[PDB]
Each structure stands twice: as C-alpha cells, then as structure tokens.
Amino acid sequence: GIVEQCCTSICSLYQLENYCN
Amino acid sequence: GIVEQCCTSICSLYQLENYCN
Amino acid sequence: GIVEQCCTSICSLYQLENYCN
Amino acid sequence: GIVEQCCTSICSLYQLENYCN
Amino acid sequence: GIVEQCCTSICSLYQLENYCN
Amino acid sequence: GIVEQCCTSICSLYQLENYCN
Amino acid sequence: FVNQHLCGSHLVEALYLVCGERGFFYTPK
Amino acid sequence: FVNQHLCGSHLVEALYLVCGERGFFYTP
Amino acid sequence: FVNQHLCGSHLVEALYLVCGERGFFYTP
Amino acid sequence: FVNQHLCGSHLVEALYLVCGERGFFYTPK
Amino acid sequence: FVNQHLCGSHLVEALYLVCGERGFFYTPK
Amino acid sequence: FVNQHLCGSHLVEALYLVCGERGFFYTP
Ligand SMILES: [Cl-]
Ligand SMILES: [Cl-]
Numbered sequence: 328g329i330v331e332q333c334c335t336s337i338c339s340l341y342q343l344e345n346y347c348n
Numbered sequence: 349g350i351v352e353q354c355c356t357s358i359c360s361l362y363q364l365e366n367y368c369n
Numbered sequence: 370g371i372v373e374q375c376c377t378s379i380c381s382l383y384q385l386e387n388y389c390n
Numbered sequence: 391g392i393v394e395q396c397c398t399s400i401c402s403l404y405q406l407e408n409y410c411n
Numbered sequence: 412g413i414v415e416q417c418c419t420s421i422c423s424l425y426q427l428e429n430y431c432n
Numbered sequence: 433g434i435v436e437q438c439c440t441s442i443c444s445l446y447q448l449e450n451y452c453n
Numbered sequence: 454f455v456n457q458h459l460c461g462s463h464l465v466e467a468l469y470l471v472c473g474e475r476g477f478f479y480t481p482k
Numbered sequence: 483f484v485n486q487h488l489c490g491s492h493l494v495e496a497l498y499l500v501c502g503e504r505g506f507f508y509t510p
Numbered sequence: 511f512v513n514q515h516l517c518g519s520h521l522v523e524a525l526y527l528v529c530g531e532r533g534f535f536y537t538p
Numbered sequence: 539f540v541n542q543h544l545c546g547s548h549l550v551e552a553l554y555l556v557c558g559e560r561g562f563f564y565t566p567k
Numbered sequence: 568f569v570n571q572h573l574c575g576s577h578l579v580e581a582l583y584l585v586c587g588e589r590g591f592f593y594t595p596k
Numbered sequence: 597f598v599n600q601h602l603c604g605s606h607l608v609e610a611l612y613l614v615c616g617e618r619g620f621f622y623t624p
C-alpha cells in the first residue's frame with residue numbers, strides 16, 4: 328500500500344500514479 | 349459531486365462526511 | 370498542550386476542538 | 391482584524407507581525 | 412515565466428518540467 | 433545547505449533568506 | 454468547522470482530517 | 483521511521499496533483 | 511518521536527479548519 | 539517576504555513562520 | 568496530472584513533486 | 597533525524613513565503 332511504499336522512500340509521480348483511480 | 353457541493357458551493361461538516369468511506 | 374497530545378498520536382476533529390478559542 | 395488587513399488587503403511583514411504574541 | 416505560463420494560464424506536466432533543473 | 437541547516441533545527445525567516453535568490 | 458469554499462488540495466486535506474480512520478474517496482465529476 | 487499521520491497528509495496532497503480528475507481513494 | 515517544527519506546521523492548518531471563525535492561539 | 543493576499547490556511551502558515559517562538563493568535567473578526 | 572491554475576505555494580509544491588531529484592528554480596518574473 | 601522528503605516539502609513552501617519575488621533554487 329501507498330504508506331508502506333511511499334513514506335520511508337520517495338515515490339515519484341510515476342509510482343504515485345498506481346494509487347490513482 | 350464533491351466539487352459542486354464543497355468547492356463551487358460551501359459544504360457543512362456533515363456534507364463533507366458524505367465523502368468518507 | 371496540543372503538541373504533547375497531538376504529535377505522536379492523532380487528535381481527531383473532536384479533540385482538536387479543545388484548542389479552539 | 392487579520393482577514394481585513396492581510397487577506398482582503400495585502401499585509402507587509404511588519405503588519406503580519408502585529409498578530410504574533 | 413512560470414507565473415504567466417502555469418498560474419495566469421494552465422501548464423501541462425511537460426510545461427511545468429521546463430522549470431526543473 | 434538548507435536541508436542540513438533547517439531540518440533538525442528551525443531556521444527563522446532571517447536564516448531562510450540566505451537561500452533566496 | 455470552517456464555513457468556506459474548499460477546493461483542490463484544501464478539499465482533500467479537509468477530507469483527510471474529517472474522515473480520520475474511515476478514509477475517503479476523492480472522485481471529482 | 484516516519485510519522486504515519488504526517489506522511490499521509492503529504493501523500494493525499496501529492497495524489498491530488500498526480501491523479502487530477504481521475505481522483506483517488508485513501509484510507510489510513 | 512516526531513519533529514516538533516513539522517508537527518506544529520500541520521497542527522496550525524488543522525486548527526484553522528476545525529476552529530473556523532472561533533480562531534485559536536498557538537505557541538511553539 | 540511575499541507581497542500578496544494571504545488567506546485561510548496560507549495566512550495561518552505565514553503567521554507560524556513569521557512569529558516563530560513568539561507564537562500567534564488567529565482571531566478572525 | 569492535475570489540469571489547473573497553479574499559483575503561489577501550490578506551484579512550488581507541484582514543482583517539488585514533478586522535478587524530484589532534479590530540483591527546480593522558482594524565479595517569478 | 598527527520599524525513600528529508602517531508603522536510604523538503606515544508607522548506608520549499610517557507611522559502612516561497614520568505615523569498616517572494618526574489619525566487620529561489622531548490623535541489624534535494
Ligand atoms: Cl489557495
Ligand atoms: Cl489531519
């Protein structure tokens with residue numbers, strides 16, 4: 328999940344898009 | 349939807365809570 | 370105080386209201 | 391008050407500091 | 412500049428990236 | 433650099449100005 | 454609670470606060 | 483280890499920018 | 511343990527939403 | 539310092555920065 | 568990516584996200 | 597020790613206020 332993936336490492340715009348509808 | 353109700357118009361707290369899961 | 374109460378645990382809207390005027 | 395001075399109008403830094411404790 | 416392109420007008424993602432190093 | 437100076441201690445407005453253009 | 458237009462990032466931050474543990478859906482039309 | 487509540491605040495704003503009109507679901 | 515300066519930044523925005531026209535006092 | 543209308547959450551964040559250790563009061567009319 | 572006017576602090580936050588490791592310059596006219 | 601990504605997010609907003617029309621450069 329986004330918190331596991333993106334809180335201790337930086338999710339780029341590209342990675343963050345996975346979490347979009 | 350949420351833009352029409354809370355951005356275009358003004359939402360109450362109760363109205364904002366309609367978009368909680 | 371709010372920092373002691375609300376930085377290491379999450380204060381809800383309800384708890385945060387204590388700190389209002 | 392602060393809305394009239396800094397939101398409705400524009401505040402200088404000095405003017406904003408009038409609302410510090 | 413960036414205000415004219417992305418604030419006054421609307422920027423694409425590509426246009427916003429013109430201001431990256 | 434700003435991150436070294438201003439992440440574990442608080443940089444005032446006065447210190448932050450060093451990082452302006 | 455504030456009585457104002459909430460838009461864009463401000464609307465999603467409001468949702469984040471108000472919904473707490475429940476979470477929320479931001480699905481603009 | 484980072485404060486989850488602060489991280490979440492940041493992530494929902496970033497998701498707002500990235501997702502745009504697609505929107506997104508978020509739960510802590 | 512969380513950075514107090516970052517926490518405070520967040521808390522004053524949350525207080526803004528929660529308190530509305532009541533307003534609030536804040537000191538670090 | 540920025541020369542602009544500061545409103546809502548932006549105004550309170552300005553106050554937070556500018557006032558530092560002194561703190562501030564946000565008491566809209 | 569959002570399709571909207573980005574101004575002020577929102578513009579600099581967009582830049583921060585979009586530019587990532589590259590960084591950015593915010594030099595208004 | 598504070599999350600650099602969150603700190604940076606905060607610092608660029610603060611720099612925006614402090615610097616105004618002077619502008620600023622930022623790199624993580
Ligand atoms: Cl705004
Ligand atoms: Cl919150």
Ligand SMILES: [Cl-]
Nearest residue numbers: 492493495496
């Ligand atoms: Cl963010």
Ligand SMILES: [Cl-]
Nearest residue numbers: 333338493496
């Ligand atoms: Cl992010």
Ligand SMILES: [Cl-]
Nearest residue numbers: 520521523524
């Ligand atoms: Cl907040």
Ligand SMILES: [Cl-]
Nearest residue numbers: 375380521524
């Ligand atoms: Cl909070």
Ligand SMILES: [Cl-]
Nearest residue numbers: 519554555610
């Ligand atoms: Cl600050």
Ligand SMILES: [Cl-]
Nearest residue numbers: 496583584605
């Ligand atoms: Cl980001």
Ligand SMILES: [Cl-]
Nearest residue numbers: 606607609610
């Ligand atoms: Cl900030």
Ligand SMILES: [Cl-]
Nearest residue numbers: 438443607610
């Ligand atoms: Cl700062």
Ligand SMILES: [Zn+2]
Nearest residue numbers: 462463548577
């Ligand atoms: Zn804003």
Ligand SMILES: [Zn+2]
Nearest residue numbers: 470487520524
């Ligand atoms: Zn919060």
Ligand SMILES: [Zn+2]
Nearest residue numbers: 515555606610
């Ligand atoms: Zn700060």
Ligand SMILES: [Zn+2]
Nearest residue numbers: 492496584601
């Ligand atoms: Zn981010």
